[PDB]
Design a protein around this ligand. Structure first.
Ligand SMILES: C[SH](C)CC(O)(P(=O)(O)O)P(=O)(O)O
Ligand SMILES: C[SH](C)CC(O)(P(=O)(O)O)P(=O)(O)O
Ligand SMILES: [Mg+2]
Ligand SMILES: [Mg+2]
Ligand SMILES: [Mg+2]
Ligand SMILES: [Mg+2]
Ligand SMILES: [Mg+2]
Ligand SMILES: [Mg+2]
Lengths: 358, 359
């Protein structure tokens, strides 16, 4: 049921936006068509975990006429797509930035035959603008609008900050200077777990876990009923774990199943595997890593991958996952004491995360 | 004085943003330093026409106090000024990447900086736009005009992005625009018409360069309903088109030394005012030679497009266009002045920064 109403609102949203461009922006049929495909290709096809979470939270809180349920669930759907569109925006720009080839089992947007890189960048910008346009259209007379948009913007900002941390993680920060060029790090002195946790917290945790929960709370007019300090603890913990999984899958999950080809090794990214390996590797292991990491060369890439499974990074992963699962469990109970309905939706959200195969 | 106050608020805004990143985003000194440099390089060095206009319109509508109101209105105007300047900074960063430009404001484009990777530049541009929202909320959280102000700011942001779409896809046959099928630059240039050009410029420049500064100035001095918006929009659109025509003409004929930026319009096969105007009057021979030289990085093929423009006396067309614009602007400003003398005066001042700008 959730999926069907969620998609119904997507058509409703798509109709409003496209018709508006046609009627108020003097847009031609050819560009309206291009934008429709852009929207479907960049916004659909994922797991919709962020969007569907808003709906489930809203529903879980609508008890603490029958029309209020309808308006609340519809508002939740719109918020769901605001987050999905926000991600679509970041994925379009992210793929360009990470030089990726595929996404969701298809070419990345900037990789489509008739999509130029220059237009792709702007297309990404349109995706973000659409989040504001839809919000203003549906939540015009809604009293929670300023707070809703205020939080949404803050999370948008946090994500951009995280992206900054991500794209500059492989360059000696002490030498970061706009006026002087610098090659990738060779000593990898900054590939630490501390630096890794910061990257992930900001680039993924906030928009993937905190935002969905928060928007679900707002449309249900129930944000002040929950322990926010515990909610953020959970959001951050789950988000970190989510990204660690994303990193692991990038290196070990076959594209066929993953839906995308990994670029972390080639992009010399400060991934969970990299920092974990480096912290435990011998000087010999580190030397070999240094002579193979950050290269497009298939064999060099293959060597890094082997260096990883010989340092038993899977054993570390299983131990990490267990540690997180334990903390999550505890935090969810603390949350359950005064916010049982909400703690339950958080449980369901963790159900879509713990040991996902994506 | 206008500038002095404007720069004081810049420092205040910068301090707020950078310190927040340090205290709430766990940012290190190195990256704080990078962002400070990114902000300065990206938001400073221009003419500040858009930002200074917000301040000037605001001050003019004031007469509609014991110092408190004036102090607040002018400061709000400065914040809005920077919101527009940061919004442009955002677009300029991305636009330079999109247009493969080399210099800007006399310096390398942001993404051309020795230590700025293209991938980071794209995101730095995103940060610039986010800052407009952060500063807005920080300073206007309690203002009654917050929602209306942000609603309008976001609409103009959206219109600008739509303009960019029109601009970047203007050299490709739209009938064949299809994500799944590659397609080369137009060879017949059938879409390089004045009609299509007016649409490109209206959305990509007119709204955020002329309408937004005025509208924001009115909002902060709380006098938005005191002006004939139909006339104000007509004026903004006309002045905006003209401004972009100047930008296109300068791209081709103003030496980079004075311009501060190297032109890329011909090499990029852009639907510029010069191209559309040339094609509409050119003989069949001129059109052939145009098609054989336009959209190439070859220094002699671009020099031929320049000579073609001079041969077709595009300066004669420009002078006439300029006069036609000046004529309407004057008549529109008079229509404004009848009901809004203070506002009409500030619009005159803006026109003065536009008309025959040497830029
Ligand atoms: C928007 S960012 C979280 C997207 C990724 O998770 P990345 O951080 O690893 O680049 P991706 O594997 O989907 O490219
Ligand atoms: C943001 S756009 C109006 C910037 C330009 O005016 P463009 O439209 O000609 O690319 P530019 O000459 O300053 O690059
Ligand atoms: Mg990526
Ligand atoms: Mg990335
Ligand atoms: Mg990844
Ligand atoms: Mg440009
Ligand atoms: Mg451009
Ligand atoms: Mg130009």
């Amino acid at each position: 049921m959730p999926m069907q109403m969620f998609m119904q609102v997507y058509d409703e949203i798509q109709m409003f936006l496209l018709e508006e461009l046609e009627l108020k922006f003097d847009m031609d049929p050819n560009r309206v068509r291009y934008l429709r495909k852009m929207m479907d290709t960049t916004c659909l096809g994922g797991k919709y975990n962020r969007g569907l979470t808003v709906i489930d939270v809203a529903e879980s809180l609508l008890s603490l006429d029958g029309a209020r349920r309808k308006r609340v669930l519809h508002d939740a759907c719109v918020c769901g797509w605001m987050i999905e569109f926000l991600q679509a925006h970041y994925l379009v720009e992210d793929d360009i930035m990470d030089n990726s080839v595929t996404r969701r089992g298809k070419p990345c947007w900037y990789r489509h035959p008739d999509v130029t890189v220059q237009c792709a960048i702007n297309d990404g910008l349109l995706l973000k603008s659409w989040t504001h346009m839809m919000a203003m259209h549906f939540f015009a007379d809604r009293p929670f609008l300023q707070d809703l948009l205020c939080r949404f913007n803050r999370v948008d900002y946090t994500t951009a900050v995280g992206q900054l941390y991500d794209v500059t993680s492989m360059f000696d920060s002490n030498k970061l200077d706009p006026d002087v060029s610098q090659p990738t790090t060779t000593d990898f002195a900054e590939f630490t777990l501390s630096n890794y946790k910061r990257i992930v917290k900001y680039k993924t945790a906030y928009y993937t876990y905190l935002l969905p929960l928060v928007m679900g709370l707002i449309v249900s007019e129930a944000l002040p009923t929950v322990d926010m300090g515990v909610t953020e603890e959970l959001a951050m913990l789950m988000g970190e774990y989510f990204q660690v999984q994303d990193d692991v899958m990038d290196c070990f999950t076959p594209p066929e199943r993953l839906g995308k080809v990994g670029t972390d090794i080639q992009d010399a990214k400060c991934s969970w595997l990299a920092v974990t390996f480096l912290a435990k590797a011998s000087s010999a292991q580190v030397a070999e890593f240094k002579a193979n990491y950050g290269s497009g060369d298939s064999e060099k890439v293959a060597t890094v991958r082997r260096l990883y499974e010989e340092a038993d990074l899977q054993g570390d992963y299983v131990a990490y996952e267990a540690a997180v699962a334990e903390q999550v469990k505890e935090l969810i109970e603390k949350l359950r004491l005064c916010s049982p309905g909400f703690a339950a939706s958080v449980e369901t959200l963790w159900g879509k995360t713990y040991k996902r195969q994506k």
